[PDB]
Amino acid sequence: GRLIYTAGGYFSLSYLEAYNPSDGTWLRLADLQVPRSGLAGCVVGGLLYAVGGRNTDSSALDCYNPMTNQWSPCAPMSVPRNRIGVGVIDGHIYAVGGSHGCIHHNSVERYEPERDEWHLVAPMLTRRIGVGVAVLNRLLYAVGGFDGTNLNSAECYYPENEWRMITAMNTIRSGAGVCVLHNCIYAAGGYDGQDQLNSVERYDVETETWTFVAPMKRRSALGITVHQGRIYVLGGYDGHTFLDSVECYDPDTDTWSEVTRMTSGRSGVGVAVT
Ligand SMILES: NC(=O)CN1c2ccc(c3ccccc23)N(CC(N)=O)S(=O)(=O)c2cccc(c2)OC(=O)CCCCC(=O)N2CCC[C@H]2C(=O)Nc2ccc(cc2)S1(=O)=O
């Protein structure tokens, strides 16, 4: 009965809408206190947090509670982080990368909801604005992005405080939807400098290889989450228009299938499931 929340986005949007893949119903919920695009979403203990983005870049961390349909302010990050990416480990929110104006972040900071406190951790090997982030059994991955100059590179964070480069992708991707499904890390979509991508690669943590799976039906700044063993990508920008298209990836048949449409097109959204 879990839901897919899309929060904020760009058409900078305040919408918080929830999709049920089991019946095609959308619900519109309480707005983001402050519109934001370029933000990330993630869930801790049933709570949905919206991080970073921009309205002016944003350091805001807000918390949405399905049980109250109310957005609660949290302590802000140590710096603004637009085009951020986030992951959770042990109930802690890791916010990696992003940009504050011309400052392209390689720093990473961790929020403990228990104390409402943000705290710095070991920065990355590379500045990554538009970074993709996912976590696989307490390893945090930052994938792609753009360092202020040039990334196919990916790197991995072990919490117990050092980042390690991993195998590079087959593709240069900033603004790529990144997730973990099963024991693999997916990097769907992105922007290679030239084109929006519809291709998707997954890193098998156990063969340390990026292999392409079927292409999507193109997009950047797309939302991405998992729901009932399936990847859902939301909206994004295909180079010409801001898509309302929501696409679902079934790993069993290795196909991407459009599965719904958002009530309005957006990119720059934060997405999570709870
Ligand atoms: N919160 C934000 O900062 C804003 N948003 C973001 C914008 C960017 C990245 C974002 C990545 C992650 C999350 C959010 C991203 N990326 C760079 C990165 N290092 O990751 S990106 O994914 O690679 C990418 C997306 C879209 C366009 C693009 C590159 O550049 C291009 O293709 C140029 C092609 C022609 C379009 C164009 O001329 N335009 C002139 C200005 C903008 C863009 C525009 O007209 N409308 C627009 C408005 C809002 C958004 C996208 C497009 S947004 O809200 O999603």
Side-chain angles (χ1 to χ4, degrees), residues 9-10 37-38 53-54 82-83 129-130 145-146 174-175 191 196 220-221 237 239 242 267-268:
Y10 185 83
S37 66
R54 104 201 155 172
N82 182 41
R83 278 160 203 175
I129 87 159
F146 165 80
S174 64
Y191 186 63
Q196 281 47 62
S220 54
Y237 179 81
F242 274 101
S267 72

Side-chain angles (χ1 to χ4, degrees), residues 96-157:
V96 359
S99 58
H100 182 204
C102 52
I103 294 168
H104 321 329
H105 291 310
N106 61 6
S107 66
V108 181
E109 60 191 304
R110 141 176 144 260
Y111 175 70
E112 339 190 325
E114 51 269 16
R115 305 264 254 130
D116 184 35
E117 283 186 319
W118 285 95
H119 178 262
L120 275 172
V121 298
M124 291 174 303
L125 313 174
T126 319
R127 313 169 182 272
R128 304 174 179 277
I129 87 159
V131 59
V133 175
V135 167
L136 210 153
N137 327 100
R138 286 155 47 49
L139 289 209
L140 183 129
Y141 286 99
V143 179
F146 165 80
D147 61 16
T149 278
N150 323 291
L151 309 168
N152 68 329
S153 77
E155 57 184 291
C156 174
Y157 179 66

Side-chain angles (χ1 to χ4, degrees), residues 14-39:
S14 293
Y15 313 143
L16 172 53
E17 297 175 303
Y19 173 59
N20 193 344
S22 284
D23 55 30
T25 76
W26 282 93
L27 300 155
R28 176 149 176 221
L29 297 176
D31 290 342
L32 281 86
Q33 305 269 19
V34 180
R36 278 192 266 159
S37 66
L39 79 179

